[PDB]
Amino acid sequence: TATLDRAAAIERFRRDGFANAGPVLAPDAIARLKAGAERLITRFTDEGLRSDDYWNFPVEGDERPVLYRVHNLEKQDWAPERDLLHREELAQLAAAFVDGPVVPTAYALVLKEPYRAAEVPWHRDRVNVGPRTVCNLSICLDDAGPHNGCLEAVPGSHLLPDDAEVAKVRATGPVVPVPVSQGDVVVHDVRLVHGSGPNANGSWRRTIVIEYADPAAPPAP
Ligand code: NI
Numbered sequence: 001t002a003t004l005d006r007a008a009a010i011e012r013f014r015r016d017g018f019a020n021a022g023p024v025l026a027p028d029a030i031a032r033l034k035a036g037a038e039r040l041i042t043r044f045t046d047e048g049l050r051s052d053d054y055w056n057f058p059v060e061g062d063e064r065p066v067l068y069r070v071h072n073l074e075k076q077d078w079a080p081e082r083d084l085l086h087r088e089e090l091a092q093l094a095a096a097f098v099d100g101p102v103v104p105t106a107y108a109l110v111l112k113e114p115y116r117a118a119e120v121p122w123h124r125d126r127v128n129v130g131p132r133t134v135c136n137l138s139i140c141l142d143d144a145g146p147h148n149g150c151l152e153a154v155p156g157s158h159l160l161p162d163d164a165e166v167a168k169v170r171a172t173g174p175v176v177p178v179p180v181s182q183g184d185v186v187v188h189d190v191r192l193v194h195g196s197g198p199n200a201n202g203s204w205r206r207t208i209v210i211e212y213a214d215p216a217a218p219p220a221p
Helices: 006-016 027-045 081-086 088-098 166-172
Strands: 018-023 054-057 066-070 103-112 120-123 134-140 151-153 184-189 194-196 205-213
Touching: 006 018, 006 088, 006 184, 018 088, 027 066, 027 081, 027 103, 027 205, 081 088, 088 103, 088 134, 088 184, 088 205, 120 166, 151 184
Parallel strands: none
Antiparallel strands: 018 184, 054 066, 066 103, 103 205, 120 194, 134 184, 134 205, 151 194
């Protein structure tokens, strides 16, 4: 029953604030991104690198800390795979969804370690811009679903006023997960109320999040 429907996906972005747009880059490109990502991750996990851009929380006792983000991803040492961040299809996808020219404003690798991943608390990425003005492209380097720690969102919430309290919005709902296959690109409005659950299961969830913005938009506060 599956389909590929870019126009409907843009419509769902406009209406619900998020959409899975399916594959954007050739599978081989996704594969290299994944490899680059893992090389970034193993430095933390296996070789013991600790830096400001490697966001982690500590666990009680024996455990090594849990890595959940690599910040400033475009600055990190992982050329030549890093160059793939700047494939033209990505910004063109974002420009289409948001219906105007865009410039990337932030690059991150977000991560669910196997077994130990925490949730990401509900939030809105930005509210100092109008709806359909700044979006995040989530390039999924893994299969992700509900009990894996995939993205969850409240449909329509990107349209709520700036002063909307995220907790009343989450408690209201509805809350809908966003299942993805490796290669999928999810695009969501920065105003969207969204989070992700914990990863208690044994798989990674690795995602490259790039923020694209109307160049006339004020910067992140
Ligand atoms: Ni977010």
